[PDB]
């Protein structure tokens, strides 16, 4: 299928960011957001470990499971931030973090943010000289910004 | 295997559904966050389940040999001729060789033939589907838990 992307791929800290859109999809079980019919577009962050992810055992390339993503989409000059919980799935290309997104302020310009937690308790590390790595993951969440996409209506 | 550690083998590497699965074991690690497994020198080993997705696992949008995560594993250890049953959850979590679902074990009834069973639910309500026709997959999670199983493994104690 046809993805269009939101802008050019980020490295951020041991990730590859990349955020694309492309028609609204059906999801099963449904998540949190929005039904085909009720959004405008499907949004997602590809989200791959770079090669300094070897530092927490990732090899260059794999998907990065159990972070926790949510996309912040404010027309440029508002004041209003709408918020969407990304969540991880399958599609026929592939995992990736995604949702179903309405533009709640219509056609035009605006600033998008990935906001991307690290795991946090679901997931451990080992770090143990033999076993383990010396990486660690982000206190704060990575921000990844793209400041001018332009919402120009189905384009599908 | 781990091209920075030594692992070892629980038995044959099965193939279950649109899973791949291998059971290994190694010296108890040192966990960070330490998770719900015993400590490091409480602890027998380390035991993994290494879960990929085999050729048929296209059908749900993963690519061949690519880890699965998102699943629940819990493992079942029984010595052979006993009743009792010990039930080890695990956890996902990176070592030097990527991520895995794992935890620390003790066998509690000592060396000997134990039966070893990893038991594996779908992701349910934690990792969605495409299933629209221009974007979606064409298969489905299971619906009852993938139940891998083998009958003669020999904790002998440790082999490092
Ligand atoms: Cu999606
Ligand atoms: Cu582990
Ligand atoms: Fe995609
Ligand atoms: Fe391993």
């Not at 099963?28 to 998540?31: D, K, L, R, S, V």
């Given at each position: 299928f046809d993805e269009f992307p939101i802008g050019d791929e980020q490295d951020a800290g041991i990730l590859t960011v990349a955020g694309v859109y492309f028609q609204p999809v059906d999801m099963?079980?449904?998540?949190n957001s929005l039904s085909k019919n009720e959004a405008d577009c499907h949004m997602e962050a590809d989200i791959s470990a770079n090669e300094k992810g070897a530092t927490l055992g990732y090899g260059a390339g794999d998907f990065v499971p159990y972070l926790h993503v949510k996309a912040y989409i404010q027309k440029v000059g508002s004041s209003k931030v709408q918020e969407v919980a990304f969540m991880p799935m399958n599609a026929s290309d592939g995992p990736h973090y995604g949702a179903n997104v309405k533009?709640?302020?219509?056609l035009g310009k605006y600033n998008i943010k990935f906001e991307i937690k690290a795991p946090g308790n679901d997931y451990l590390l080992?770090?143990?000289?033999?076993?383990?790595?010396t990486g660690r993951f982000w206190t704060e969440p990575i921000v990844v910004e793209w400041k001018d996409f332009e919402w120009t209506g189905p384009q599908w």
């Open positions: 099963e079980p449904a998540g533009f709640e302020e219509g080992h770090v143990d000289k033999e076993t383990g790595v």
